[PDB]
Design a protein around this ligand. Structure first.
Ligand code: CL
Length: 128
C-alpha cells in the first residue's frame, strides 16, 4: 500500500531523464511493490520474490512468514525449491511526467525532493 510513502501525487521532484540530464517533473502515479527476500540452499538469494511464489504458506491471505522461517516456493521454472525466508520489503514506485509530457517510472531511491541537498554530480546536470 502507499502507507508510509513520503512523496505525494502531484508533488514536483527531480529525477534523471532518458537523455542523461536531471529535470523537475511532476508525480502523476504512485504504486507499491512488495517483494520477499529468501535465501536458497546453495547460498544464493532473491530479494525480488513475488509473495505468491510461496507455496508452504498462503502469504496473500495470511501475510509473510516469520523472519527466519523455512519455506517452500515455486520458482519461475515451475519447480519447487526450499529456502529460508529473510524479510518482506514494500517499496514505493512513482510515475513522473516531464515538461515535454514524456513519462518515466522511477523508484523512490532515484527521486530527489526539492528540499534535499543535491550532489555536485547532479547540480551539474540539472536543467532549468
Ligand atoms: Cl539456480
Amino acid at each position: 500500500s502507499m502507507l508510509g510513502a513520503d512523496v505525494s501525487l502531484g508533488q514536483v521532484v527531480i529525477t534523471k531523464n532518458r537523455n542523461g540530464l536531471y529535470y523537475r517533473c511532476r508525480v502523476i502515479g504512485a504504486a507499491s511493490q512488495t517483494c520477499y527476500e529468501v535465501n536458497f540452499d546453495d547460498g544464493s538469494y532473491s530479494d525480488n520474490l513475488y509473495p505468491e511464489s510461496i507455496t508452504s504458506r498462503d502469504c496473500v491471505q495470511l501475510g509473510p512468514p516469520s523472519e527466519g522461517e523455512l519455506v517452500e516456493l515455486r520458482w519461475t521454472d515451475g519447480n519447487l525449491y526450499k529456502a529460508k525466508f529473510i524479510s518482506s520489503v514494500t517499496s514505493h514506485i512513482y510515475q513522473v511526467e516531464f515538461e515535454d509530457g514524456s513519462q518515466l517510472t522511477v523508484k523512490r531511491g532515484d527521486i530527489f525532493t526539492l528540499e534535499e541537498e543535491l550532489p555536485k554530480r547532479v547540480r551539474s546536470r540539472l536543467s532549468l
